Symmetry: D2
Amino acid sequence: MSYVSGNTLIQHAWQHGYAIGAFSVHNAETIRAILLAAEQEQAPVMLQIGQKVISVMGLKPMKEMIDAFMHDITVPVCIHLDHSRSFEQTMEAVQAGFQSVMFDGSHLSFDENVRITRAVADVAHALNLGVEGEIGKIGGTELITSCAEALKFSELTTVDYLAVSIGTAHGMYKQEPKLAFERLQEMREIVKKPIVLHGGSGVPDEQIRRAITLGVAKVNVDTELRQAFTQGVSEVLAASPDEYVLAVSLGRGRDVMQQKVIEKIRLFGSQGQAAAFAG
Amino acid sequence: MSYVSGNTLIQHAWQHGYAIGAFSVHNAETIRAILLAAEQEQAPVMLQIGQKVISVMGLKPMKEMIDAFMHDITVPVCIHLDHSRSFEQTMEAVQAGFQSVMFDGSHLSFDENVRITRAVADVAHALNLGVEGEIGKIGGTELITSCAEALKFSELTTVDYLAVSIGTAHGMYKQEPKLAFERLQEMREIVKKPIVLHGGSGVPDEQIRRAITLGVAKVNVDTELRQAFTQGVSEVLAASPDEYVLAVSLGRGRDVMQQKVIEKIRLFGSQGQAAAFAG
Amino acid sequence: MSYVSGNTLIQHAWQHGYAIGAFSVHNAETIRAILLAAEQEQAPVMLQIGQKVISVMGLKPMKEMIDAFMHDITVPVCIHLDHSRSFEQTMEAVQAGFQSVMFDGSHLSFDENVRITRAVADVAHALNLGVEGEIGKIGGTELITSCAEALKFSELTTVDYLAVSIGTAHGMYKQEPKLAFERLQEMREIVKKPIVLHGGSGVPDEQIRRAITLGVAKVNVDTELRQAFTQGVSEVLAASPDEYVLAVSLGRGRDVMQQKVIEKIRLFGSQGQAAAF
Amino acid sequence: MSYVSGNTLIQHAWQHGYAIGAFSVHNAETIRAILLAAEQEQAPVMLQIGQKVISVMGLKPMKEMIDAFMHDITVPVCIHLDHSRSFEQTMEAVQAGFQSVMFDGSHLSFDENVRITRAVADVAHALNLGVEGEIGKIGGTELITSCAEALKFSELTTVDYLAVSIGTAHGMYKQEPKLAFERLQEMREIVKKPIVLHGGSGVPDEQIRRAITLGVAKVNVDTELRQAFTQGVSEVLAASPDEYVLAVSLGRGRDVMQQKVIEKIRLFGSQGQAAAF
Ligand code: NA
Ligand code: NA
Ligand code: NA
Ligand code: NA
Ligand SMILES: [Zn+2]
Ligand SMILES: [Zn+2]
Ligand SMILES: [Zn+2]
Ligand SMILES: [Zn+2]
Ligand SMILES: [Zn+2]
Ligand SMILES: [Zn+2]
Ligand SMILES: [Zn+2]
Ligand SMILES: [Zn+2]
């Protein structure tokens, strides 16, 4: 399997002014949409196993399902644990052979977030896998992170890439977001680490491109892919409600989601970058 | 993994006047619907990997996906290759560690069907996995098999269980089927092997119960499960077209399909029979 | 595969006044000797992958070789990393799916031993595997740990089982050892955790038995098994130097080692205890 | 893992006038000797799992042990079932993911040998693994196959490579063998398939070289490797009977066996040929 450390992918992106897309997986067809998109675009990609899919399918089953679909894939792939709020769950992902983990301690006190994130980072560093932490809460579409908090957190935790609160939120945006570009620029010069953008779904393309120049090197996309999938399925079933061939109904969802992943890969500037990791 | 030879399951069913449900799988949620149904009902089950899913997801990936979802399952499970028209593909399933294979030579000449089916049977017998063959064409809802053809075929091939044409077809039935009960009765006394009913979707419950008494010991169900799945998905998306949580839309499909599998397990008389295979 | 947490095994031993034998593995025949002994005796066992075999065969290859030989085994088995002095190597064993790890920080300062041992313990507890640490150096056969130092170490690290310096050493004993029984008893009552005996090869049987009743619940055996193996091989090759059937020469080593493992299982009081799990 | 069909390897050897060495494995150290030799020589190799090791260690455990030791190997490797006289056992190797199988029907009637060998071949061809059969018995060192019988057998069975009786035998040679070179040449031109040489241990080097130029493209070596292994072990234990470090005693066996495998790789003309795959 062409699996690569998240640290390897993200550092390369950060050093070359592009971002790795971190695409959330939910089942077989969503895994395939992402992998086929990456293989077509010759792009390194992160597949994110997050809290919701863990609750539905299980952490280890989702890892094993990715493994099963890697047979024809030659591009760099990193399996990433998203939004973990448990040291135990994070260690389960490490034991299951993930290539990146996020311990999200953003709801803990600063000191407690530091303590657990550092413990996770030490494990990740030991095993050559990527580690993400978060300082500053990112909520739902339903507190911009300070430079000081981000620097202190980064230095005490030794995280490889850092999620910060910079004007995004998870879900479909009610109001169009406006990213804290000035804050990102300060962090580039002070924190000097790759930044992770949570809540990438529905952020205007122009703002993504700008954010990447300022050191965003991982962009998380989940909702926009599930919307694309749901649109494809809906199209089939609204037109032909007695279409019972899943290869048609869910396969159209797969196709529409694959197009969306291709769109994001290109937005992020990650197309063609697979070549950089062969040698 | 609690995996069991298809021959072991089917002989027990046949000897005890019940049938093993052979439920076709298509993706993660459909695997889970079947396994959760079997675990709840304490029923032995066959999961069928057929031609359409092979074309979409791949033979080995679907096997590996079942393996991934077996973590919490304690009932007897048999992975079965359905509708194979290739010696090569059948051998791939054997190598991938399936517990039953069907070589469907029903479109070949009698002698050619015998020749290849026997070759597959010898491999299956060697490795303690079940083998199914078919004599007589079974088409789509868009030639009842003779006793003589069934006996000769059965004796020359050494198949463990036999598919015959007895009034069923694949797909949604236009006209209600009427099974060839007299023919089944003759076969019970002459062929003296368990019979497989293809085209189990939409057959009246009373006719299934009667057929099982006459020696049907495997009932194949695919379309009716995909209909149930599609109904659940459709319900969510017709009510809430912007519901993008797959755990809700596809999970309702999973739930409605799980209820249908439970309904079939009970129809077949396989509920509670898991106990018979522990010891 | 009948794999069980080291903590589950050792706690049960400690609770019931017996010990789990921790038998060091080196290759295929040594793995088989141990597993066949355990299966015959219906005994829980630990198979220890230590530093020498890691250097020769590799950590992950040795794990996978154990897996390969578990096909016909029904007794509880725990794969244990022995004598790790590296956080990185200890994490490698965790990722490879070991059921117990020893971080041996005994050559570090107390503070640094506590720091790294605690980090390993946190990982082990999260994943339901056993964790061993060591306070006080245990050397070669060619200095007793205090109760207070053992308590402080134990409480700060949260280890499941603890190696202490109690009168043993690794290798062939020059002089006959004398264990610190009274110290063991104090630890049993104050530290209240299972004690691991390093240097179990060649200790008089009566002293082993006594140590186990006083709360030694894991006994490490390596040298005595390699001696048994080597004796069996030597016997064949000295008698028939042109015996080229490895099934005969190395198989006799396997047989003589298997008898030794059976002997240790019984010494430890672990025979029949598979039923409890 | 760099695993390659036996047919792919043997065809390439035959096409280019060299042979693949088929080295019998028995345990961890023997596997490592062979793999390290192949990796050093950048040579494609076959590792043969035969009847004796199946009886001792098991078919599937030996496969899994090879897998465990492939972590650092980049050369083409083919795991081959040797001397199977059971359709069932041959199917077990297929299911365990071997890259080549030998069904040895040479003790059966011609018709029955053809029948079972053909059935095995059909399975092998379907799954892209190599298949070997045998016409004419090859015994122990303590009768030449005809060209016509070899052609009929070959055409009916569709084997990829064929073992024939050509002047060799298994074990330590009592008398020096003399191969049937002219018969080999006839087979090369009429049968037009790669020939397998059983009993490769102890055959004079010049006769091996000549046989390979005449279309022998797989050479089986077992006894000579076990002798090399046994010599290394014996050396250590005779000199230092209380040497209990298996890394020393069995490691010397490994080293001496590795040198022997290197010697055979070069003899066969397979060094450097990894580049071709
Ligand atoms: Na969003
Ligand atoms: Na139907
Ligand atoms: Na000792
Ligand atoms: Na010979
Ligand atoms: Zn977040
Ligand atoms: Zn987020
Ligand atoms: Zn059919
Ligand atoms: Zn059918
Ligand atoms: Zn020690
Ligand atoms: Zn020690
Ligand atoms: Zn032979
Ligand atoms: Zn031979």
